[model samples]
Target: VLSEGEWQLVLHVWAKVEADVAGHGQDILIRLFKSHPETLEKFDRFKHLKTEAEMKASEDLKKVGVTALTALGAILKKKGHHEAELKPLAQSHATKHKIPIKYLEFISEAIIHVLHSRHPGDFGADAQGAMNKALELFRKDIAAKYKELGYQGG
Candidate 1:
C-alpha cells in the first residue's frame, strides 16, 4: 500500500483534473497544442504523444500537472500572495510574446465556455466554484515550484 501522504496527493490530483476537464472541455489540452504549436517544442512531456488521436486517448500526466498548477494558484491566492503572480506564470509564453492580458484571460474564459457546452452537468452544480478550484490547482503547482526553488509563503 502507498503511504498516507502519497495517497492524499492522489486524491488532490483527482479533484484538480476533475475541475479542469469539467471547466474546459475534454479536448482543451489537444486544442492547446493546435492553438500554439510551440507548446510541442517547449515541453517534451508530450513527446510520446504522436497524433491528436493519441492525446485524446490519454490524459494521465496532463491531468496531474493541471491539478498541481490549479492547486498552486488557489493556495497562493488564499494566502494573499498576489505577488506570487499567477496568470503570468501560467501564460509565461503570453507574457514573453507581449500578448495582451485580456487575450490570455479570454483564452481561459473561452475554454470554460466550451466546457459548459460539453459538460453541462458537471460545472452546472456550482460554476464559479468549479472554475476557482481549477485556478487554485494552477496556483498550487506554482507554489510547489517556488518552494522547490527555496522560496515559500504560499
Candidate 2:
C-alpha cells in the first residue's frame, strides 16, 4: 500500500496521459473539476502544477486522483489501447499493484469504448492503427528493461 500522496502522483500522471491522448482525459477532468473547481487553475500542466493556497486547502484532491484513474480506465479501454496496457501502466505507477483484466470483461469493455469514442476526433481515420503502434512503444520500452518478461517487442 502506498501513502496517499505517492498514489496521488502516480495516478495523476497516468490518468493525465490517458486523458490528454484521448479526448476523455478532459471528460474525466471536467467531472473532477466539478467537485474541485479550485483545481481548474492548476490543471494547466500536471508536471508544473502549482496549486494556490485555495487549492492546497481543498480536500477534494484525494478522491479526484483515484476518480481520474477510474475515468482513465473507462476511456482508455474504449479507445482500443488494450487491457494489457493497464496491466503494465499500473505496474509502472505503483509497486506491485497488479490490475487484472483476466476476469474483468466489463472494465475492459468500458476502456475500449472510451478510446473508440475519443479517437475519431483526436487522431482521425488512422486513429486505431496509430494509437496501437504508439502504445506498443510503452510495452516495448519496458520489455527491453526486463528481458525475462519476454515481451514480443523485445
Candidate 3:
C-alpha cells in the first residue's frame, strides 16, 4: 500500500520512465532477459534476440512491449482491479506458456532499476518500498491464479 505521497511519486516516476521508453515495452523485457536469459525460452519470437541492441532494434519486439505496457497501464491504474483483470491472463501464461509466476519478479526488478535510474535523487527506501509493494500485488495475483490451477510450485 502506498501513502498518497508515495503514489504521487510512483506515478511521476512511472510517467518519466514511460516517456523514456515512449511506449517501447520491450526495453524492460529485454533487461529481464539479459539478466535472466533462461526466461526467454518462453517467448518463441524473442528467444532468438541475443543482444540488447538486437532487442532494441526489433520492430516486432517494440510492438510487443508497447502492447504489454498498454494493457498493464489500465489494470495498474487501480490496485484492487487487478485480480479480475489478471487472473485469466495469468492462467493462460501458466497453463499455456508454462511461464512460471516467479519469472514475474524479474520484470519487477527490471522496472524498478529503470525507475531508480530515472529518478535516482528521489528514489529512496520509502519510494522503493512503495513501488515494490505495488508490484508484489501483481506477483501475488499471478501466483495465486497459478496455484488455483493446481500447479503448486512456488
Candidate 4:
C-alpha cells in the first residue's frame, strides 16, 4: 500500500540499516524493553534478565534480533505484498506465541526510533513516515489474519 516514492524511501533507508540487522535489531529490542518492560517478560530468553548488561550480553538477544529484522526485510523486499509470507507468522503469533498485536505496534515504534537514532540523516521525517505506513500495512495484514483465526486483541 506504499506509493512508488514511499517504497523507494523505505527501501533506501532499509538498505543502510540492513547492513547490521543483528546489531540494529538488538538496539531495537533493547529500546523496546526499556520503554515496555512488560514486553521483555514475554520473551522467555530475556524475561529473566534483571539488568540491562545481562540482556545485552545474552546471545539469544542477537538471534532474536536477526529473526525480527529478517522478517521485516522479507516484507520490505516484497514492497509490502507479503500476505502469504506473513500468514504463518501471524498464526504463530496468534496461537503459539499468544503475542498480542499491540506488541507488534510497540516493536514498530522501537524500530523507527532505532532507525532514526542510527541514521538520522537518512531516516528523516519523510522516510520515517514512509516506514511507518509500510509497518502499519504489515500489522494490519497480520491483524486481519489474527481475526480470521478467532483471536482478538490486535
Give the per-residue lDDT of model 3 (tens digit) for 1-154: 5567766666666666567454436667877888988888877987667778888888888887777676666556664467778877777777787776568788889878867766787677887887787788777777888888886534
Query: What TM-score would every model get versus the actual structure?
Result: 0.40, 0.31, 0.84, 0.95
Q: Candidate 4 on 34-55: residue-level lDDT in tens?
A: 9988888778867777877787
Rank list by TM-score: 4, 3, 1, 2
Estimate the overall C-alpha local distance difference test score of candidate 3. 0.73
Best by lDDT: 4
Candidate 2 overall lDDT versus native: 0.41
RMSD of 3: 2.2
Higher-scoring candidate on TM-score, 2 or 3? 3
Candidate 3 residue runs with Cα over 4 Å from true position: 20-24
Off by over 4 Å in 4: none
Better of 1 and 4 by lDDT: 4
